[PDB]
Paper text:
Merbecoviruses from bats, pangolins, and hedgehogs pose significant zoonotic threats, with a limited understanding of receptor binding by their spike (S) proteins. Spike (S) protein is the major viral surface glycoprotein of MERS-CoV and forms homotrimers. For the MERS-CoV S-trimer, NTD is known to mediate cell adsorption by binding sialic acid, while RBD is known to bind the human dipeptidyl peptidase 4 (hDPP4) as the entry receptor. The S2 subunit mediates membrane fusion and exhibits a higher level of sequence conservation among CoVs.
Residue numbers in the entry:
A (entry chain B): 391 to 412, 418 to 584
B (entry chain A), C (entry chain C): 39 to 766
């Protein structure tokens, strides 16, 4: 339907990605693209209204952080921010927005390099909290809009229904590029 | 009669021991300085060649302080314009002189006021810290590459430590660790933004109208501690058009939940590093072993490879957790840790397995691991003769732990019982440095058959000179207290007669993990006192001392100022009971922690001691730095340990000083033990009415190490001791 | 046998000197505070009445430090929460109590931390300084009007002085001058922006774990001095709606050409004010007389009404130019200026005309003008018996200058020789306070016939108490050095024998315009030393001393530490030559300037003195403040007088200290003579290799005056003196 909302305002970070569930696909001409890869249905195949559902997740994402998002990756991004789900056919875009668009740049790019739970005899046992392909991050609540400076350490006391330990999260910051690079995934149902 | 050791003999340093300081530049070769030259030596045969000559130094307009050798031997690094800052930190100017070309390098020189300079372990790469920022030169003539851009004075430190770290955590100014072959440079960044500053005045030279205020970020007990980060940079990918990329290695989450320290950095292989982190409550420590991933250019520390080191009865380590010693493959290492009995012994670790196996056992402690080759490990321990104050070199067989051989026990038994060693680059030759009861002796040995090659330094001239001097003697024995042996030493006057009664001076430090009773030859103030004034100078190792097990050492835990003081007093009582000690003339003196113990003893109201001297003493434990104080006492909060913090002050005992004579000395520019402590002691003593003697030393640090101030302080203390003992 | 004056008697103050402090509220009434309540006394025939009771003081919760009475007698000002800052400055809280309604005035109260409060000379107008700003209360219950808005802490001072003005120029914290009938309020504004600050550490109460740095704007010798402006405000025009306007009175044109000082403010009439300005080179001063102009609202300062005081041989005044004493009509005034022969005397001026007629002459000096009346002038002078140390009250007819009568020369000649005076509002009753050779005596007189009314206090009880004890005796005499008499005083021990030999201690100040040899009865540390320890304590008045002409006082101009040192040494030589002084046992001691003279005497290498004590001594004249040092030495520039600034230094002579025993005492929180001065003395002595003794005092000002600190320091110096003379 209408894809105006993704375009307007400040785009969100990778770990705090925003999903719109709904056709068209004219908007890919709006900005330069770089990666249209898919694991299910191949790109350029659109059924218009025949699709049962259409979900998109979008987020500001630098192009230097490219090898860390793949069908198979071992890095901070997949482990703690965003792992792609292959149950439904998806397509990565990783396009670069141009100038003179209604897109206010974020201050900087941000992602979480560590996010674990501490609980033991004397806070000894460390349990990394790896995220699911379809779920958000437990460490999202630490600065959803990004970090100021690099290597921030956040901590909180987890309550019940979450494990009941101490959640520790470390974030990383990469300075913004001259033009805003963003990332999309399009899952067709 | 014959000559004695006088005060001018000690102050003017008439009799001087000689040393043989060498730098192994190879498995079979080393450099030695004699007659202002640089001579390279062959360890196997003993012949020497002139590495650097006399006339080379004279062409510079400046005076060279120190020299450094490139591992390939192509470049010297000459240090001049030395300016000292703290115990380990300084600034200097450096110039690089080519040894093949025989010329100074005048293009792109190292800037002035450089805080630290270091060579790579191989090659001729240079990393130096200037203005709290790290620069790397791939070649001495090419321009340097700026690694960090965040350096700021008294706020951000890159590659160099802040005061509290340099004083208590690292005992060094450098925070740079090169890779084993120099491909990576690891460094720590410190942040002193919220650390409070200590302010004291510095008068300077008399031409200065207004004194300067010195502001040092100093975290006192319970204050805000510095923040540390760790980065590794790849020096093989440095470019002139791109800023260097530093990959940060974060602490384990068991430390990120609160305040913590970085305690040790040790490279295992070319792409593995080990990092040791300690909590502010310094009884929990974790070693993190991180590897380099070549796909990502990132370093990853697995959870399974973390090693926990905790202490239930005290703190972790003697002062800090010990250093690991990895094997060649880097998959295992040896560490000295405390056993169930409480004795420090070498335990064998696997990088990925939690349990480690002890290879040494006993009612003795391993002092340090010296070299680790294949099939043999070299270490220093006080196993021999049960004497805690002796040091001897042992080697153990890795294929069979039951084959332990002492390499220095029977070399010269009477004269040598305190040993230190330095091995070659492949541990093929080692120099045995002895400083035992006799004169120090330096010998060279080959480890292939443990045979002695030659004697490097015999101290024959000093032996010849000392035959015409009535010299004092040292006795090392023990006393039994509650079925526990506690060791003491006694500097006895010449022609010592047990029948006669002598005045006794108790030299005390009594700090945690300290050893004042050992078999070490010294020429100090106590020699003069015993040789000339016929005063017995005694030192005692009580509860809280080191190298005797955790039971003795950890008795002081959270109770500083209680057991060491009582042990000193009971030792004095036993000494007076021995029969040759004048009970009326007994004194106690100490420096730093020894000054605190002296003041506590004098305020104890025991009546044993006639007088005492405290030099730069600690008065209140809330005035001292956070790392040292919280290692032993904890936080000064009402929940944790504030009451002892309040009960263990020298001020509280000011009423009891009316029964003793007190000499209190401090240097005004002290940055370790601030003048505030002595000022508070004196203020308390004036309030209660006690008459005492004081002396401030203008512009003098903790050591009071300037020649004039050193001579003045020892002359003043000798005058005070002579007056106390009524010595004619 | 009998008791003596012991150290406890001095320290515990067993023998109290009773005083009669009265405040003349009116021409014939005064307030006296006995038994903790204020009483009104009729000066004619006693007739005492109770003004306030003790129960009223009990009402308010806090303790009252001081009280001030409104001139109309309707209000009282109660001062509490007293907190001292410097020698003359403090902060306090104030409460106003109505004396007719007998209640507190709780509305529109004076704020806390008030720096200065003063009543108008008539009525109940109130002006106070808060946060360096001036507020005026027309009535004690109505709101206050803010006068100045530019007050800034340590930068801009309105109505109060800065450090240097309070210490050296005005000798007071107040820079407020009410009009004679309370219409105008004159004030001075001080700007210390470019004045450099002195910083020293304040180790506060033991609970403070980080010492505080005290920053005080302090102009040292040759540094930027504070700048001043003078304003007069009209308090009758003050309105709530508008801001008040202040009219500035500028310095003369001859004074604005460089740095200058405001040294005196006096109101001549209800619409005329006189100001004295002094140059930075303090040998030139100008008096500016200015009249209010009703139409303009402005103050006009005529050039013809300017009087110039010059000094070719030295500085102007004793410490500052003297104040004028105007007549009732304000067209003429009397001032004490130096005559052609160098002796200060009263000269009669006319505001319009330059020439001044001297009304007194002779080889003696006038100490001050006490009261002026239509018919007579009262003054204090040392004319009687030709003794510079005595003081007596005189009177001179204004219609015949020949008729001069002494009002206190023969009242009790033996007991009283040092007089001071307080005169009633119309000068018809005065209180004479003698403190001469005998015990202090207070009497009341009436000016109409100079008759004695009654004795207010005779110190009979101390006389009864001092008969049992053994007291020393003071001898005051003179010696001839070069055809001139210099006066000395000696405290002779009880049962003094001329054939016996005694140790001698030299009590030294020897500052410019000083008198250590006078006829004043004191109970101090010398009484103990003479009474108990049988030590002669002697003082000398040599060159540079005051009250004996300008030829003696100006002899040390631009040469400080030269003639007074040699004069003290020659005095000690003459004392030893007198016959009853042990030549082996001679000591010298002093405070402040006296400590400087003691240090230079000890470093002179004369060999006369065995030991010495210097308490808070000046070491270098470039470390002291600008006004005091440049009054006597000039500027420390290579143009005029840098050479003597470098020559006159205690450090220069540190090599001569080997032959003496030295005690150096200083307080760490000294703001007058900073600790840096002793810290440099000690550094020089340690560098040379001199054995000496030192003692710091934590948080102690120039006068080390606490209970504990004072007792401790005098006990310590008594111990040092007893060790010097080998006393039991
Ligand atoms: C050496 O140590 C000192 C002291 O520890 C370091 O200085 C501190 O630096 C941190 C930065 O990490 C700083 O904390 C920020 O302060 C800002 C100003 O007070 C705050 O605005 C900011 O909060 C925002 O950012 C957080 C993420 O860091 C968010 O979680 C938070 O919700 C806030 O969110 C705002 O910003 C986002 C955009 O990021 C925006 O979209 C939101 O709407 C919202 O407006 C941080 O709290 C400390 O104040 C500093 N302390 C000082 C100076 O005393 C110093 O950096 C260290 N030096 C080095 C080299 O490491
Ligand atoms: C490397 O980093 C430094 C600092 O991060 C860069 O220097 C900054 O450059 C910008 C633009 O030229 C200036 O506005 C800043 O003032 C500079 N800061 C400092 C501290 O010098 C530098 O440009 C970077 N180099 C490269 C090649 O990117
Ligand atoms: C120094 O050690 C590094 C790390 O082992 C070596 O770098 C590797 O060299 C091998 C062989 O040339 C390459 O396959 C790797 O990709 C290199 N890794 C990195 C991170 O550079 C380097 O060769 C060594 N230098 C010597 C031995 O001179
Ligand atoms: C390190 O020391 C602290 C302080 O002594 C220990 O914390 C104590 O733990 C015991 C047992 O859990 C409690 O009973 C105490 O109340 C704790 N004290 C405080 C102040 O919290 C801690 O357990 C030690 N860590 C170890 C031994 O690993
Ligand atoms: C106090 O003195 C300072 C300097 O002596 C004054 O500041 C100056 O103000 C003038 C404005 O007339 C500026 O031109 C100068 O540049 C200022 N100098 C400095 C050093 O700041 C200040 O105005 C004075 N304050 C008062 C109340 O008189
Ligand atoms: C009296 O003078 C003061 C200061 O000159 C005035 O206070 C200022 O008023 C202006 C305008 O309201 C403000 O912008 C300033 O911030 C004020 N400064 C201060 C220090 O208060 C005050 O308004 C004047 N009063 C009258 C009646 O004119
Ligand atoms: C205090 O003295 C002042 C100054 O002489 C008096 O003020 C003048 O008073 C006269 C007569 O009342 C007026 O004509 C003038 O205009 C006033 N001048 C000023 C500047 O106010 C004042 O009256 C005196 N007050 C008292 C109570 O005597
Ligand atoms: C106040 O003292 C200064 C400094 O001593 C006098 O200035 C000197 O004046 C004489 C005579 O003109 C010159 O020879 C000197 O060179 C001046 N010295 C300096 C440093 O300038 C000044 O004359 C004195 N003033 C009075 C009124 O006596
Ligand atoms: C080098 O100089 C020192 C003193 O300057 C001298 O003793 C020594 O003999 C010299 N070296 C040689 C090889 O002569
Ligand atoms: C010592 O002599 C041997 C020959 O036996 C030689 O190989 C070696 O290089 C020499 N060492 C030095 C330092 O000259
Ligand atoms: C160090 O200072 C000296 C003296 O000013 C100067 O000649 C030299 O060039 C400086 N060194 C560098 C590397 O700038
Ligand atoms: C230390 O002093 C505090 C303060 O009274 C007290 O509560 C505590 O019991 C004392 N500790 C000991 C061991 O006496
Ligand atoms: C005492 O003084 C009061 C006024 O204060 C007066 O009324 C009274 O008459 C005086 N007493 C005499 C004169 O006896
Ligand atoms: C008023 O009270 C004080 C107590 O401070 C007491 O000394 C004095 O005697 C009392 N006055 C009278 C008249 O009793
Ligand atoms: C002064 O301080 C006290 C105590 O804080 C307070 O009660 C009083 O109101 C203050 N005075 C004024 C004038 O604010
Ligand atoms: C200071 O002393 C030197 C000698 O050291 C002398 O030449 C000079 O004239 C003196 N300056 C004075 C007294 O102003």
């Amino acid at each position: 339907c209408d894809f105006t909302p993704m375009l307007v305002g400040v785009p969100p970070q990778v770990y705090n990605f925003k999903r719109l569930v709904f056709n068209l696909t004219k908007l890919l001409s709006l900005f330069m693209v770089n990666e249209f890869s898919c694991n299910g249905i191949s790109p350029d195949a659109i059924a218009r209204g025949c699709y049962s559902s259409l979900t998109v997740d979008y987020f500001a994402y630098p192009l230097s952080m490219r090898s860390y998002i793949q069908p198979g990756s071992a890095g901070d991004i997949s482990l703690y921010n965003y792992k792609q789900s292959f149950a439904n056919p998806t397509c990565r875009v990783l396009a670069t927005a141009p100038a003179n668009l209604t897109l206010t740049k974020p201050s900087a790019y941000g992602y979480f390099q560590k996010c674990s739970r501490v609980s033991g005899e004397h806070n000894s046992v460390e349990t990394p909290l790896y995220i699911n392909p379809g779920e958000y991050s437990i460490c999202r609540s630490f600065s959803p809009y990004g970090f100021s400076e690099d290597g921030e350490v956040f901590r909180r006391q987890l309550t019940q229904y979450e494990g009941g330990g101490i959640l520790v999260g470390v974030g990383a910051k990469l300075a913004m590029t001259d033009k805003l690079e963003m990332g999309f995934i399009i899952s067709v149902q | 009669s014959r000559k004695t050791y006088t005060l001018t003999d000690y102050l003017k340093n008439t009799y001087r021991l000689k040393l043989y300081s060498l730098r192994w530049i190879s498995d079979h070769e080393y450099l030695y300085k004699q007659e202002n030259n640089i001579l390279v030596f062959n360890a196997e045969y003993g012949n020497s060649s002139v590495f650097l000559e006399n006339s080379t130094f004279d062409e510079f307009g400046h005076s060279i302080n120190d020299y450094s050798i490139s591992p390939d031997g192509q470049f010297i690094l000459l240090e001049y314009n030395y300016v000292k800052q703290w115990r380990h930190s300084y600034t200097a100017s450096y110039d690089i002189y080519d040894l093949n070309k025989r010329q100074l390098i005048t293009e792109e020189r190292i800037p002035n006021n450089t805080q630290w300079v270091t060579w790579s372990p191989v090659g001729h790469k240079l990393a130096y810290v200037w203005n709290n920022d790290i620069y790397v030169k791939i070649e001495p003539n090419l321009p340097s590459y700026r690694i960090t851009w965040t350096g700021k004075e008294d706020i951000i430190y890159n590659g160099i430590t802040d005061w509290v770290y340099e004083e208590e955590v690292f005992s060094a100014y450098s925070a740079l660790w090169w890779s084993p072959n120099g491909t990576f440079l690891a460094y720590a960044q410190f942040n002193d933004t919220e650390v409070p500053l200590i302010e004291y005045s510095f008068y300077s030279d008399e031409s200065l109208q207004y004194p300067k205020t010195v502001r040092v970020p100093y975290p006192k007990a319970g204050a805000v501690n510095p923040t540390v980060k760790f980065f590794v940079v790849n020096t093989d990918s440095l470019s002139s058009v791109t800023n260097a990329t530093s990959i940060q290695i974060t602490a384990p989450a068991s430390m990120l939940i609160g305040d913590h320290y970085l305690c040790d950095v040790t490279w295992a292989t070319q792409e593995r590093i080990s990092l040791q982190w300690l909590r502010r409550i310094q009884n929990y420590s974790v070693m993190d072993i991180c590897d380099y991933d070549e796909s990502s250019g990132r370093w990853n520390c697995l959870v399974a490879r973390q090693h926990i080191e905790m202490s239930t009865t005290g703190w972790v380590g003697r002062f800090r957790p010990s250093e690991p010693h990895f094997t060649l493959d880097g998959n295992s290492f040896y560490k000295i840790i405390s056993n169930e009995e409480g004795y420090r012994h070498i335990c064998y670790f696997q990088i990925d397995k939690k349990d480690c196996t002890f290879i040494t056992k006993g009612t003795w402690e391993v002092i340090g691991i010296e070299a680790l080759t294949s099939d043999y490990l070299y270490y220093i321990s006080n196993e021999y003769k049960g004497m805690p104050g002796g040091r001897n070199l042992y080697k153990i067989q890795l294929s069979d732990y039951t084959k332990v051989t002492c390499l220095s026990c029977e070399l010269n038994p009477e004269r040598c019982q305190y040993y230190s060693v330095s091995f070659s680059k492949e541990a093929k030759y080692y120099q045995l440095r002895c400083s035992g009861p006799g004169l120090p002796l330096y010998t060279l040995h080959s480890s292939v058959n443990d045979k002695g090659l030659r004697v490097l330094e015999d101290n024959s001239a000093l032996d010849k000179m000392l035959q015409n001097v009535q010299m004092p003697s040292k006795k090392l024995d023990f006393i039994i207290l509650n079925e526990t042996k506690f060791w003491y030493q006694m500097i006895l006057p010449p022609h010592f007669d047990k029948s006669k009664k002598y005045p006794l001076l108790l030299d005390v430090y009594a700090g945690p993990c300290s050893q004042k009773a050992d078999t070490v030859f010294r020429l100090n103030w106590a020699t003069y006192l015993a040789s000339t004034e016929n005063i017995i100078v005694a030192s005692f190792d009580g509860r809280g001392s080191g190298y005797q097990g955790d039971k003795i050492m950890h008795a002081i835990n959270r109770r500083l100022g209680t057991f060491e003081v009582e042990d000193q007093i009971e030792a004095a009582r036993q000494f007076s009971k021995m029969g040759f000690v004048d009970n009326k003339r007994i004194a106690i003196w100490g420096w730093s922690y020894g000054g605190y113990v002296t003041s506590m003893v004098l305020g104890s109201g025991s009546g044993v001691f006639k007088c005492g001297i405290a030099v730069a003493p600690v008065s209140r434990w809330e005035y001292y730095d956070s790392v040292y104080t919280e290692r032993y006492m904890g936080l000064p909060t009402p929940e944790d340990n504030l009451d002892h913090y309040r009960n263990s002050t020298v001020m509280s005992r000011a009423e009891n000083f009316k029964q003793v004579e007190y000499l209190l000395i401090h240097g005004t520019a002290d940055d370790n033990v601030h003048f505030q402590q002595s000022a508070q002691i004196s203020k308390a003593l004036v309030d209660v009415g006690v008459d005492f003697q004081a002396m401030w030393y203008t512009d003098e640090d903790h050591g009071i190490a300037s020649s004039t101030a050193h001579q003045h302080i020892y002359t003043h203390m000798s005058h005070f001791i002579k007056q106390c003992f009524s010595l004619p």
